Amino acid sequence: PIVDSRIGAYLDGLLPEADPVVAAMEQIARERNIPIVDRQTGRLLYLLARIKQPQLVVVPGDGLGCASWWFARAISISSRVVMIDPDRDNVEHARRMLHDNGLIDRVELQVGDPLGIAAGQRDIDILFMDCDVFNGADVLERMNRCLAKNALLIAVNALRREFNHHLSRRRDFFTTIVPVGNGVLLGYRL
Amino acid sequence: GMIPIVDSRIGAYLDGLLPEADPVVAAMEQIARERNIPIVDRQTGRLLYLLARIKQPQLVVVPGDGLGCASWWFARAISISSRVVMIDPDRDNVEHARRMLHDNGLIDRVELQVGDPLGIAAGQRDIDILFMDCDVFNGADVLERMNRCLAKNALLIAVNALRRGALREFNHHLSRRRDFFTTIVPVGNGVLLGYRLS
Ligand SMILES: [Cl-]
Ligand SMILES: [Cl-]
């Protein structure tokens, strides 16, 4: 357990009615057995992006375009979410979802190698990452140069390694791991 | 020990990632423990700092602040062109904060006042970050008085949201406010975050 099950149950009870887009995506994930960002985590992503007001958000790997949806909902047309996934299915699901909901205008989607393609970006304001898929150390070796001044690294599934300690021991980042969902590491570039 | 929030094992791990402690902060904890004053724990203060850095506020208002602990975290996160306005009825709180801030020089961007926290806070305008302690104030009441003082897209940060310094009244209220986007992060005693929609 990350947080007491009674606390988690309570926080869920306080939730508003779900967005049918999110409810629909949660069904597809469930059946295709695709892991996706839980709802408390997605809400945090949305909050963070609204506060941060990023111009560029990069998402290397995104099951059903789930993270991309939370981020897209948070930015205006003057900004962009760039999503890359190696599975054409995740990309086509995401595309249809964003198109249908009037957000495709601010989201760039590509089928391919996530970090391979993501590294072509510059001045990234928010870099999203899934610890279940990539090792932070590997990610930063290839992406640190793509980060904007005061960029925010958001790493999900951070609690459930060497990376959590490392990012917490370097002068160029202010890092904290919040116990939301499966743990979310937030690394702010100083 | 009280209402449990983060698993003890997880808590220990997160604490193990904490960097070497600032003696300023360490000096403040003990003083808090001797004057029996509740203060923001380190994981919580670090979250405050991070949120403030990404928010980039011009004005942060802290109505009520034991030993100036909250103001200390916020002061460190803002520019010389910005301000933290701290109000507390106790002269010892205000003086403790003045000293720390004078000592680190950040007194240059912090306004400290001895008085009624809400009475004085209510005179502020275009507040970017409004800090709040759920143990001391009825959130709904604070917001009914202060919403008018908030800047576009202000952020509300309410501590002791899940347990006393789980869950309480302001959580139920704020979650229903269609004018805010809210979430509760279960760090420390729980932290309620409310973003004021455009
Ligand atoms: Cl580049
Ligand atoms: Cl610290």
Side-chain angles (χ1 to χ4, degrees), chain A residues 1-26 28-29 31-87 89-95 97-121 123-144 146-148 150-190, chain B residues 1-19 21-32 34-35 37-90 92-97 99-143 146-166 168-198:
Chain A
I2 284 162
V3 311
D4 188 79
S5 64
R6 291 162 297 189
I7 294 297
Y10 172 73
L11 296 186
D12 287 345
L14 286 168
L15 292 171
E17 191 171 2
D19 176 331
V21 164
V22 174
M25 174 164 51
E26 290 172 344
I28 293 174
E31 75 195 24
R32 295 187 192 173
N33 200 13
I34 305 177
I36 64 174
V37 167
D38 83 353
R39 202 165 158 198
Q40 296 291 359
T41 301
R43 291 178 60 84
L44 175 64
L45 299 184
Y46 174 90
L47 176 56
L48 291 176
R50 288 297 308 263
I51 294 173
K52 185 89 177 64
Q53 299 199 358
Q55 306 309 308
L56 180 56
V57 185
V58 179
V59 187
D62 195 18
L64 302 183
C66 185
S68 304
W69 173 262
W70 291 100
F71 290 127
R73 291 257 36 245
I75 63 165
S76 75
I77 210 67
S78 65
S79 303
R80 290 292 178 273
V81 175
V82 172
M83 182 270 263
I84 316 94
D85 197 83
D87 191 342
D89 290 328
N90 283 322
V91 171
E92 286 305 307
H93 174 274
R95 194 186 309 285
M97 175 179 65
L98 290 160
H99 179 273
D100 283 356
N101 292 283
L103 295 172
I104 197 58
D105 58 349
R106 71 200 72 185
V107 184
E108 169 184 340
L109 304 182
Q110 311 191 48
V111 178
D113 183 327
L115 304 180
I117 296 186
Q121 296 296 314
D123 280 330
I124 300 176
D125 296 309
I126 301 181
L127 177 59
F128 176 90
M129 192 196 311
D130 187 342
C131 296
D132 281 342
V133 173
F134 303 112
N135 177 353
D138 301 344
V139 172
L140 215 49
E141 292 286 359
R142 301 199 219 180
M143 309 292 302
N144 198 109
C146 309
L147 300 172
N150 297 148
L152 181 63
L153 177 65
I154 302 175
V156 301
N157 295 319
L159 294 174
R160 224 67 272 187
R161 201 78 152 187
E162 159 193 301
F163 183 67
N164 291 348
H165 177 87
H166 169 78
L167 208 60
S168 296
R169 291 285 175 270
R170 55 186 294 184
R171 188 190 201 181
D172 60 334
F173 282 87
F174 181 90
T175 301
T176 196
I177 302 178
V178 297
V180 58
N182 279 299
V184 180
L185 173 150
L186 304 169
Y188 178 80
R189 201 152 75 82
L190 291 167
Chain B
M2 314 92 309
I3 290 301
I5 303 180
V6 183
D7 173 24
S8 51
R9 302 176 292 271
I10 294 290
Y13 167 83
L14 294 174
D15 300 350
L17 296 174
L18 284 173
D22 184 340
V24 178
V25 172
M28 178 168 57
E29 292 170 0
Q30 275 289 359
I31 283 176
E34 83 183 28
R35 302 188 193 186
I37 298 173
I39 68 174
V40 157
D41 70 11
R42 286 179 68 190
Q43 295 293 354
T44 300
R46 292 182 60 85
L47 180 62
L48 294 186
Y49 178 88
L50 188 141
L51 291 171
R53 286 306 300 268
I54 64 170
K55 183 76 175 73
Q56 301 198 333
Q58 306 163 222
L59 181 59
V60 178
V61 178
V62 187
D65 191 17
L67 300 180
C69 183
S71 300
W72 185 85
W73 291 96
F74 291 124
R76 300 201 51 158
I78 69 167
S79 63
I80 190 178
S81 59
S82 306
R83 294 293 181 273
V84 175
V85 180
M86 179 292 207
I87 309 87
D88 193 284
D90 191 6
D92 299 336
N93 281 332
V94 174
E95 176 64 2
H96 184 266
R99 298 182 185 190
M100 292 192 298
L101 293 163
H102 179 271
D103 283 343
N104 67 14
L106 301 174
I107 192 59
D108 62 1
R109 72 199 68 183
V110 181
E111 175 190 342
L112 307 170
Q113 312 199 40
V114 167
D116 184 57
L118 291 182
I120 293 178
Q124 295 287 313
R125 296 299 183 270
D126 291 318
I127 300 171
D128 296 310
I129 297 183
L130 178 63
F131 180 87
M132 219 195 299
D133 186 346
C134 294
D135 285 345
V136 179
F137 306 99
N138 176 337
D141 293 349
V142 167
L143 197 53
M146 300 299 303
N147 198 44
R148 299 185 297 271
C149 301
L150 299 181
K152 172 180 173 177
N153 297 153
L155 178 68
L156 184 70
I157 306 176
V159 296
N160 302 325
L162 293 175
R163 70 184 179 187
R164 181 159 301 262
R168 257 209 161 103
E169 209 198 64
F170 189 46
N171 299 339
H172 299 257
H173 176 81
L174 194 61
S175 66
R176 283 170 168 81
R177 286 197 54 160
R178 290 198 180 10
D179 51 337
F180 287 86
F181 180 89
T182 306
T183 200
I184 300 167
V185 299
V187 62
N189 295 335
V191 181
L192 176 59
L193 303 173
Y195 178 86
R196 205 162 84 102
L197 296 171
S198 303

